[PDB]
Structures are given as structure tokens and as C-alpha cells.
Amino acid sequence: GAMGPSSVSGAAPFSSFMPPEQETVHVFIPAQAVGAIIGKKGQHIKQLSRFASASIKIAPPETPDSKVRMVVITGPPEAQFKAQGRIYGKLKEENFFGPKEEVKLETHIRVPASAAGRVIGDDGKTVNELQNLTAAEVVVPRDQTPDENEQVIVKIIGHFYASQMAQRKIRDILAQVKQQHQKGQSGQLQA
RNA sequence: GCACACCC
DSSP states (O other): OOOOOOOOOOOOOOOOOOOOOSSEEOOOOOOOHHHHHEEEEEGGHHHHHHHHTTTEEOOSSSSTTSEEEEEEEEEEEEHHHHHHHHHHHHHHHHHHSOOOSSOOHHHHEEEEEHHHHHTTTTSSOOOHHHHHHHHHHEOOOOSSSOGEEEEEEEEEESSSHHHHHHHHHHHHHHHHGGGTTOOOOOOOOOO
16 A cells, blocks of 8 residues: 555445335426425425335436426335325425316336337337326337436326326336346247 | 425
8 A cells, every 4th residue: 555644535334234125216396396395394205204104305406407306206106106196286286287287297217228118118019008008108218318327217297196007017117127137938928 | 484305
């Protein structure tokens, strides 16, 4: 080594084994609403984390050009139901999406870069039928974010019921897509 | 009166 005058450092406070196998997605709410979504000193938003039993966080602008702040929901689908159900209700609170309109709030879910291409389907038919099952608007971009992050986003537009069902289904195929690592069809499939 | 927090 080399003894540098007061040039000694380290600081390694990264302990504990917290299993991050909870579903974590980014809920798209523009800066015009995100503020009041947190609510009063940010107390009841953390209270929400308690009664939902999930990790409710507000993501700082992932891009400096964002007019929106995404809610980082880390929780089981049981909790996500309340969390996102009430988050869409916060849209209703100020009626940003539309006064008479039913809730139309975008949710952004992070999928592996190639997995977004495969949610379209191995034949390309799957993305169309996904919309038919999810009851939501699933738009899969060819760009979104460079594969430098090996991960992109699909945008879900519609009602929270639809969004919640869409999110979990696309997030669900991700695991099955990654199963390609096995590489070896030691069995059949009806496809 | 509406926002800020979310970990050590």
C-alpha cells in the first residue's frame, strides 16, 4: 500500500441480508399530484406502509427531464391492491386525469430489456392477447431505455384493477422468460 | 390546508 496523509478511507455500512424478492414497480404520477400524494409530513404515507405491510417509497426523478415522480411500491400483490387502489384514488382526489373520467393512471413496470420484446410474444400475438386478459392498455416500446441497464419499461394505462392485474402478469412471465438459462426442453409444451 | 418523507 501507500501511507497517504489523512488519505485513509473505507466506510462499508452495507450489512444485513434483506431478500428483495418482493414485487417492485414504479407508479407514474406527475409532479402536479405526487406532492399531496405523500401527505402531511410524509406521516400517513409511511402509515400506509404499515397497514399495507409493504414498502411505500417515492422515487426521485430517474431522469432530469421527468415531469413525474414514480411511486416505488415494494410489496406482495395483497398490499399492492390497497396501495395502488388508494394511489389511483389520489388521482380522483384532485381529478387530474379527468373529472368525469374513470381513473386513467399510468403505471410503469420494469422488465428485462429482452423480456419486453418477448411479452409481445414469441409469435408477436401475445402482446395483443395480453391486453385482452389484463383489460389494460399495454404499450411496449422498442426503445424506452438502453440495454446498458439490461432493462426497459412497459407502460400500463387504464383502471387500477386492470393495471394491477397487468403488472403482475407481465412481471410473472419475466421469471419464466429468464428460465431460458436452463436451455433444454426435457419436456413438451402446448405451443 | 395542498410535498418531501421513504433507510443508518
